């Protein structure tokens, strides 16, 4: 099985970029034995990366030529990224909470990317010690993944390991933000928690949720702003509450299933878009969480933590995080998620590059909404049913084409074939 490489072309203008694509395709067609793995390294290391950039992520000739022909003709393609190389500013890794995971994600990438494989095995060790079960087995088990005590720790492992893979291609956060359980992954990646201690928090909290809350609630994201949602929650006081404010067109609510179904009728009649959060059978960030406080604080006890080596913008407060103690990790579950606030605080401090470290993008559209009118690059990592190194590289390419530093050459192979 051939391995995907990022094949980069650029020009000073979009027309020059398109002509360069045509030229390369022509050169490949004149040389039938020449593959993407022969040409990719010199196209990155021996050519100027100009103002208008593209990458085709391809493992073979035919797929490269398909990408290049699309690019030459000004069309989109599924493994073609292109852009203006005009983004500057600091880099944020965003860690999602619920609703991004898809069954079977991470297995293919474990096979394909040794850095990700390594991180996942390091996670597996810590989770074996804690939860008993074997991370790699559970990745492909749709029945186990509907259990909150399995899903949350698996989800944590996958996003931490994706962050390691980003780091291996030179994409390191200047700041991090984690939504809901993402905050624990963010804290670890920022150096405030060991892998072991972060894992312990996710494992103990998720198991408590599964014992006490699973089956008693639901969560719903709505395409609307918080003012609008709050107005529509008139008469739902103490039944359905605001659980997250993600942006101007994304607010999540929480409560008992029946009560949330009543609220969905309110939204439906009014032609508003909404969906249940996948993987979530509990009323997160609601008064239902009060009953869990005492057992959670006892289970967690004293948290071993240190000062984050880079800023961690909490979604508990919308501000740089203070003590990451047991009380903080309770509030991370009880209190509404201030995701919009956190992202806004980062935009106001010169952050312009946001990398959602997730199996499928769930918060990128909010980051894009919040970032306007600033010049920004916002990307995810994987997508539903696209869990290969090829998809990871396309996301890295999406940063490269906007002028963000990323070491695509790490995965470009050992080609010496020129022009």
Lookup: tokens for 105: 């994600």
Token duo for residue 194: 């060991």
Q: Which token pair is 71?
A: 């690019």
For the four alpha carbons of 53, 55, 61 and 66, in that order, the dihedral sign comes to negative
Q: 60 lies in which domain range? A: 5-84
Q: Count of alpha carbons within 13 Å of 236, Cβ hemisphere only?
A: 25
Residue 93 CB-density burial (10 A; 0-12 exposed, 13-18 middle, 19+ buried): buried
What does residue 177 show for φ and ψ, rounded to 5 degrees? -145, 135
3-state secondary structure 186-223: HHHHCCCCCHHHHHHHHHHHHHHHHHHCCCCCEEEEEC
- Alpha-carbon dihedral angle through residues 270, 276, 282, 288, given to the nearest 10 degrees: -20
Rounded CA-CA distance 80/325 in Å is: 44
User: Nearest-5° angle of CA 117, CA 123, CA 129?
Assistant: 140
Q: Quote the CA–CA distance of 89 and 402 in Å, as a whole number.
A: 12
Please tell me the distance from the alpha carbon of residue 224 to that of residue 36, in angstroms, as a whole number: 45
Q: In whole angstroms, give the CA distance from residue 170 to residue 406.
A: 5
Tokens 């956190």 appear where? 342
DSSP for residue 336: P
* SS3 state of residue 159: helix
- Whether residue 373 is preceded by a cis peptide bond, meaning omega within 30 degrees of 0, is yes
3-class secondary-structure state, position 253: strand
Nearest partner of 356 among 188, 166, 148, judged by Cα: 166
Q: How far is Cα 38 from Cα 34, in angstroms, rounded to an integer?
A: 7
**CATH number for the domain including 71?**
3.30.70.3290
Sheet holding 80-84, edge to edge: 5-11, 52-58, 80-84
Helix 148-168 vs helix 195-212: crossing angle, to nearest 10: 150
Check if the beta carbon of residue 99 is closer than 8 Å to that of residue 277.
yes
- Nearest residue to 403 (alpha-carbon basis) of 353, 335, 364, 356: 353
DSSP label of 146: G
Sign of CA dihedral 408, 412, 413, 415: negative
What is the C-alpha separation between 386 and 157, in angstroms, rounded? 18
What's the CA gap between 3 and 36, in Å, rounded?
10
Strands (E), 42-111: 52-58, 80-84, 90-95
Calculate the CA 1 to chain-centre distance. 27
From residue 333, give the alpha-carbon distance in Å to each of 95, 247, 336. Answer: 15, 19, 8
Resolution (A): 1.8
What is the DSSP code string of 127-144? HHHHH-S-HHHHTT-TTG
User: Are the C-beta atoms of 274 and 221 separated by less than 8 Å?
Assistant: yes
Instruction: Name every residue whose Cβ is closer than 8 Å to that of residue 305 and which is 6 or more positions away in sequence.
Output: 187, 192, 193, 197, 323, 324, 325
Cα distances from 99 to residues 38, 206, 220, 419, in angstroms, run 40, 15, 10, 45
Residue 59, phi-psi category: left (phi > 0), alpha (psi -120 to 50), beta (remainder): alpha
């Amino acid at each position: 099985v051939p391995v995907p490489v990022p094949v980069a072309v650029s020009g000073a203008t979009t027309a020059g970029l398109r002509a360069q694509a045509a030229r390369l395709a022509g050169h490949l067609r004149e040389r039938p034995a020449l593959g993407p793995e022969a040409v990719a390294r010199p196209l990155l290391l021996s050519r100027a990366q100009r103002e208008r950039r593209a990458v085709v992520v391809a493992a073979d000739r035919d797929s490269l030529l398909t990408g290049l022909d699309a690019l030459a003709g000004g069309e989109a393609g599924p493994r073609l990224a292109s852009g203006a190389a005009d983004v500057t500013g600091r880099v944020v890794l965003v860690f999602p909470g619920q609703g991004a995971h898809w069954t079977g994600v991470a297995e293919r990438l474990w096979r394909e990317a040794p850095v990700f494989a390594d991180s996942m095995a390091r996670c597996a060790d810590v989770l074996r010690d804690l939860a008993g079960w074997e991370l790699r087995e559970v990745l492909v088990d749709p029945v186990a993944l509907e259990r909150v005590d399995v899903l949350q720790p698996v989800s944590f492992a996958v996003v931490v390991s994706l962050a390691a893979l980003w780091a291996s291609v030179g994409v390191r956060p200047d700041a991090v933000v984690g939504h809901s359980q993402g905050e624990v992954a963010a804290a670890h990646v920022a150096g405030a928690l060991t892998l072991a201690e972060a894992a312990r928090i996710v494992v103990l909290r998720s198991a408590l949720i599964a014992r006490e809350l699973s089956g008693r609630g639901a969560m719903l994201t709505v395409v609307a702003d918080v003012e609008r949602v709050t107005a529509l929650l008139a008469g739902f006081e103490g039944r359905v509450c605001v659980a997250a404010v993600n942006g101007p067109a994304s607010v999540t609510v929480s409560g008992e299933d029946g009560a949330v179904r009543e609220f969905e009728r309110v939204l439906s009649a009014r032609r508003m878009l909404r969906w249940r959060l996948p993987g979530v059978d509990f009323a997160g960030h609601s008064p239902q969480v009060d009953a869990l406080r005492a057992e959670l604080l006892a289970a967690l006890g004293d948290i071993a933590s240190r000062e984050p080596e880079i800023p961690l913008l909490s979604t508990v407060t919308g501000e740089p995080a203070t003590r990451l103690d047991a009380e903080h990790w309770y509030r991370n579950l009880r209190e509404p998620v201030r995701f919009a606030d956190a992202v806004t605080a980062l935009l106001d401090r010169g952050h312009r590059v946001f990398v959602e470290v997730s199996p499928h993008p769930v918060l990128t559209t909010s980051v894009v909404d919040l970032a306007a009118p600033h010049r920004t690059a916002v990307v995810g990592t994987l997508r539903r049913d696209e869990g290969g190194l090829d998809r990871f590289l396309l996301s890295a390419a999406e940063l490269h084409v906007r002028g963000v530093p990323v070491d695509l050459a790490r995965h470009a192979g050992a080609g010496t074939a020129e022009v």
